[PDB]
Amino acid sequence: KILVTNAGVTEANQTVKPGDIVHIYGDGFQEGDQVDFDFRWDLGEPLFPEGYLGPVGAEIVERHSNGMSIRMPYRKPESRVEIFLNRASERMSLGKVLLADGQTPKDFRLYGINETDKTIERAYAEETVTGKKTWDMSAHPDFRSVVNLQKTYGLCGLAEENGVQQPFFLDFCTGEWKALSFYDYNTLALVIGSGNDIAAIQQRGKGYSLYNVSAGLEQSNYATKTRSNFPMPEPQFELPEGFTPEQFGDYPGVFMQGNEIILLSARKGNGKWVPMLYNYRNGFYVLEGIEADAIIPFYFGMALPDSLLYQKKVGYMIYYSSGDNRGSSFRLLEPDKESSKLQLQEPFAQLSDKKVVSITNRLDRIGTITVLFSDRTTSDFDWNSKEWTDYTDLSDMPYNSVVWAN
Amino acid sequence: KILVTNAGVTEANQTVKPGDIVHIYGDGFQEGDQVDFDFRWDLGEPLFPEGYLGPVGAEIVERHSNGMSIRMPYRKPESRVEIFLNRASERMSLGKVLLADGQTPKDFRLYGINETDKTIERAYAEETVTGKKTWDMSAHPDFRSVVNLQKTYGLCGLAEENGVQQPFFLDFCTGEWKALSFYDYNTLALVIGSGNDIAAIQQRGKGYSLYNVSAGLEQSNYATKTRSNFPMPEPQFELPEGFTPEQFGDYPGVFMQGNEIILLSARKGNGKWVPMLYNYRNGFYVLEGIEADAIIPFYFGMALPDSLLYQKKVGYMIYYSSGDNRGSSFRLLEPDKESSKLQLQEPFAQLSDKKVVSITNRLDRIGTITVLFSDRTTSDFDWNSKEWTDYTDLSDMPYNSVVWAN
Amino acid sequence: KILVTNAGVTEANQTVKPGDIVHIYGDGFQEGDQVDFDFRWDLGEPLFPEGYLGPVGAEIVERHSNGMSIRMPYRKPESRVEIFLNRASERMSLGKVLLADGQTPKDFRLYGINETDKTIERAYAEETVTGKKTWDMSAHPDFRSVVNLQKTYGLCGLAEENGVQQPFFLDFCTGEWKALSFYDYNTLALVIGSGNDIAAIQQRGKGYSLYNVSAGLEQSNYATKTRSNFPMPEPQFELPEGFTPEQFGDYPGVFMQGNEIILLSARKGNGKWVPMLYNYRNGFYVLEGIEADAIIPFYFGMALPDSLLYQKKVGYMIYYSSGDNRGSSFRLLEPDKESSKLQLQEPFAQLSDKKVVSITNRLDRIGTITVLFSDRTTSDFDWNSKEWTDYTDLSDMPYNSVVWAN
Amino acid sequence: KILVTNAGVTEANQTVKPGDIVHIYGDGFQEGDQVDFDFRWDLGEPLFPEGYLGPVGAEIVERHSNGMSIRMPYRKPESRVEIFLNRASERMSLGKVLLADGQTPKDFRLYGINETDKTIERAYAEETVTGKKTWDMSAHPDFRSVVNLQKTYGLCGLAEENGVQQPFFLDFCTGEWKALSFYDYNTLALVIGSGNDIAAIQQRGKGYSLYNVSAGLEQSNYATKTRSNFPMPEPQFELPEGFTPEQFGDYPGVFMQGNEIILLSARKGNGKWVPMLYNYRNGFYVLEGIEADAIIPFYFGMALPDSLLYQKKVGYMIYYSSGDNRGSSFRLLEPDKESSKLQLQEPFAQLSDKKVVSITNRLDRIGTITVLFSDRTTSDFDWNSKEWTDYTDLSDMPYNSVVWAN
Numbered sequence A, B, C, D: 001k002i003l004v005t006n007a008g009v010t011e012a013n014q015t016v017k018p019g020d021i022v023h024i025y026g027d028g029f030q031e032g033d034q035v036d037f038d039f040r041w042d043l044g045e046p047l048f049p050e051g052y053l054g055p056v057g058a059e060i061v062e063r064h065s066n067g068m069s070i071r072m073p074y075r076k077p078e079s080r081v082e083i084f085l086n087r088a089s090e091r092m093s094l095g096k097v098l099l100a101d102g103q104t105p106k107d108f109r110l111y112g113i114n115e116t117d118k119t120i121e122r123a124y125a126e127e128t129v130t131g132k133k134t135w136d137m138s139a140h141p142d143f144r145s146v147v148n149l150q151k152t153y154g155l156c157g158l159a160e161e162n163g164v165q166q167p168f169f170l171d172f173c174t175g176e177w178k179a180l181s182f183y184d185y186n187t188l189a190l191v192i193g194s195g196n197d198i199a200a201i202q203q204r205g206k207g208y209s210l211y212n213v214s215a216g217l218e219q220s221n222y223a224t225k226t227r228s229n230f231p232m233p234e235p236q237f238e239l240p241e242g243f244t245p246e247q248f249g250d251y252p253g254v255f256m257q258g259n260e261i262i263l264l265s266a267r268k269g270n271g272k273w274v275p276m277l278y279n280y281r282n283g284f285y286v287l288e289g290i291e292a293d294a295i296i297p298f299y300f301g302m303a304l305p306d307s308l309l310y311q312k313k314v315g316y317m318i319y320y321s322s323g324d325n326r327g328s329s330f331r332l333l334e335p336d337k338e339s340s341k342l343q344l345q346e347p348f349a350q351l352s353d354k355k356v357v358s359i360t361n362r363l364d365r366i367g368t369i370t371v372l373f374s375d376r377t378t379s380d381f382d383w384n385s386k387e388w389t390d391y392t393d394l395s396d397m398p399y400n401s402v403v404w405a406n
């Protein structure tokens, strides 16, 4: 069983770049034929064992009976790549190429959402950086609740698709969008802070369940498979009376330490906001007594995560436009020294006459948050010194949302 | 694009066992359609994040236009498994099953090769063990140079296939044989002791190169892909004058610490044996001055490996049937206190009137080897105490080769 | 500032064994002078970096103005040991010795408490083992609630000291007892199952707090410092009305997954037993509705711990001497599929006409417990197969408590 | 045996800062009494187990019979610290304090040596940084061959002490100098690139041996013990004829991958430079055929190190003031594709009319070096893109040596 005759790779034994199109030729290709890569690399000098990866499905761009076009992937080191035709069980070697390094930079960079031009813009990167500054966001202009999973070199967020809110990943390497959910279930919110996963609260049926929607990214066949369907084995829960899905998802939810309780905020019809807690075992409940002009959940990562119990302090940024608490207050959500109930603590930071519009975390730091104010200002708060520190390069900032990412 | 209509899984929402056949039905299946699994598991109590795996190709056993039979895999924990039809790009969910635990036992067990019945036999396991004792070896009755890669729950070795020696993996879960090399190149020897890989010296063309032949096992799509083609980026080397491939491979080669030099032994036409060293950068050379009646390379693992620099002492067991050194001597190969050259050290252990016929390592111990003698006896040597300790259960042992494995 | 003159080590440049006495001589020693070790080792062949340890305080056995006797420690590899005189700030090298390997065997072994002879006995070890079988327990004949912290090569438990129950470590290497608590506070119980620590509930003042009492063992100056004082920063709690300290501590408590809730059992005056839960944030509460003839908490470790979130299923073994539930029932404690409250589940294993008197865990296995019955029988239950498997070597067993240890 | 009466800590139960003096009082203190700390911390919310450390020797600043002054250490998180009096065996608790966070920032920062003012200056740190900019270098104004061990928050280098070159650590937290060698042996050079250790070539006796001189820093009692004495168990080697110690140490040596061969450069009397290799098993040898106007060894770290086999490409920067190779050439030292001998490769980067005066590595990047030129310019070379990238903030730079550090 020879799969194809007079076959090969046009670019055989040449050096090719991540993102390039490689061409395969031959007689006898069939509908459903797939293409696999095997990678071999040496990071420094060659030693046994080397670095190995395979089989990794190749993205097929064009397809005919006389050949096919495939795309070379990013995110591998410089590699000897062997290209195989895969017909069900069988594999046949077509040829080899040398693939130039496609590893993504690991330094954290700040990105802003430009709603005027509908673009993601790189707002800050540390010195000796100038790759490519802007990404077109016009395929999903409503991109919302934007967050980063460390090392993915792209952004996760919510956007309208088939009449509901769904999670997408924007890949910085290609500028392409990848759906993260298998089914078309409406998504209340993304949830960050677990440690090394992005979760989402989605409508599994009559009610809402907690899903892992980043598992397709943290996995070696990402290129050909990104949609996940991983709900928790817990019951579904309805929203409390009065509340509707459109009231959620403007800001990411946050896992409390232990990852059992999730902090959300909901926007009421009259423009006021309430804190809302979610327990995947018990459901939704409103944290009573607070109705403010803006509420954003946050967390401080008190140690570096490992890609295990991720240690953190979480809370709500609470903003009032007027009165005795005019401005933005940052208050931790912690259990009472008396007993079980979760109570909002007195503020550890308060900024009168300033409105917080975005919060995000640089994960190569510990115990800090990065905040975007308007009167625009970008500033870090360090938990251990209890002091703010402004970014002096970043006063223009024509953005309502910014996000740290690598 | 709905792939198939009136489709599903016969065993949908039921509990199935690893090794079972699951049936898929529907109208519109096509040649080349594949099937993918996504796994979700909770080892203890459920917490976010859970355990996830996917896509993992399913082995397809039977195939028609109205449906297909697939085999459920071993080596995953108890999992919710979602089954997808994969037609090139597209995926469609067919159904879900609960897959019972398929994790393999991690305790080290001793296995012997029975050349009379052509079977692998479990010779020793520690208390409270009685699973399944024997495996049929008749598909490859010449199975040779048998070794284990820790945690694979099976045995690697050499056997004749298409007129040459090639590496195979015998899977203990199924009793099935998997080819480890993609091409049909003759294999001089398997090489163990790197830390977490099995290598092989194979004829890449005019000469011999060093390959990694276990990479297909240490990889999540093992079930549908096991053959590797991973030579080192080093030149090919011919054997020294006089020597031929049939003289090698009776015993596994051993990596010295640093994994640059490999110890081999070769059998001459007259029944004598010589030590032979191999450097993947420089080629083959005979360690001069020794011609004995049996030579087996060995290593001591002086720390537990991590699945990084694996620390060890290596050498040759040298056996003479008569004379002043009658019996089996164990001598380390180390560099001279004077300069570079590798010299055989004086023995650290010597057994007169006993012939060593197999050596193997239990990797949950440190600094020991396990040895099989004939006058049969099985005994451990502990480097730190310099003492032998016999296994009292294991005097019968109708085997010439035994191997520790998990 | 030369500390001492005409000084040295009697055994300078010689090979010495762990446990040996080494002698130091010189003029000018002072009260309070200490002795430090620096260790250098090569596990396999020498490479940079080597293995290093230092300063490690030496145990001083005898002391005079003309010299001192020190004990060489166990638990290091074969090492070049440099011996330093330490006078406050200053250090002076006295000499060097070669210390033979003192690493303790890592294979799990079963030990029984012999109350007749007041001895710890090795009841089981796997083949090729015969070191030293018995340890004298007469210094603490009431040694109770015996458990192992993996890799410590000794046993932790409770014994009477200064009129109260306190934690001790019996070191297998020396047969010597080490106190684990700094203060003389009464100990209700040891608590196991956290992952890599032994906790204890102790009377910090008016009430009880949770302590870590193994931290002194998991620390490189263990030889000279073992007593810890590490309470949690949580309030103290009294026992519920009626209960008294003498009712606790016969069996180790067990951490539920997440390490927030602890399972205990308490013996009433009339010989009946009740389950008692402890929350370090909220205090003690009786798990109502159960009054049995014996109750022992247990856990299954569902993955190997790392020395992170340790995954497990925990519960109570509940024994009744008569009636519809005659015998020993094993029931998990889990939260209801309905809501928050912790409920005892229906049994996953039940043994009529057999009384469980000890439960313990072999941590190189996953998902098993080891149980000791009387009609004596020793048997493993495997969570994944739901089957018992008896140890056929272990029917005599003149013990009420057995413990797995390495 | 009560050690001291009417004793306590002046600052008992108060919050104190790293670097502060804490006072201990009482009657009956003795010469040689030491003081130990035990630390307990919770990074996020409290959970069992917490973070623990102890015993950690306290630095004693003042000492009398009625009390003592101790310094509170840096580099721990915010901790409950219990303070113990240590008299030989015995310990007594004196009191407790709350120690504010002393963790050092982990972001890499660039530091320059100012030979005019004799100061270490912080030349670059990324945004939102302004701690303390300058450190006084006047205690060792000849500080030379300056390097960083990651996470130490200070600088290692060579300086004159007792008539010879010796390694010192300058601690950024305190500005204090710590000796790294126990004995007063002349040091040819520091050697970097092993992965997580700083080595040094030092005169052990008649000849030179390889030492680990950073082990005292990577160790929890660093505060009271920094001097190491850890030579390799290899013979001593003399320098080749003609060469003298004053010709070495201007630049750090570099370990080749595998850490067996070390690259050095030596300055001749006439101002010319030669490459010199060192093998700890075989000794020194000149890499013949090269005599240049400046030579600096370097390495590229091709992966992040783990604090295992550190992968890297190493070589020599070779500078000529005139001729066909005017300027600075960067050439790897690799083994020939033909055989064993180490040959200088053709340059991978060449800068005509620019002189390299310092090279250093930012270890949160991979595959880069940072270089300081004069015509001053600071620039990164990225191995994977083969492109330079200048730091635009750093043109003034009144330094001959700069170093990346955290």
Ligand SMILES: [Cl-]
Pocket: B125, B126, B127, C125, C126, C127
């Ligand atoms: Cl056994």
Ligand SMILES: [Cl-]
Pocket: C242, C268, C269, C270
């Ligand atoms: Cl009572």
Ligand SMILES: [Cl-]
Pocket: A125, A126, A127, D125, D126, D127
């Ligand atoms: Cl910057």
Ligand SMILES: [Cl-]
Pocket: D242, D268, D269, D270
């Ligand atoms: Cl000269």
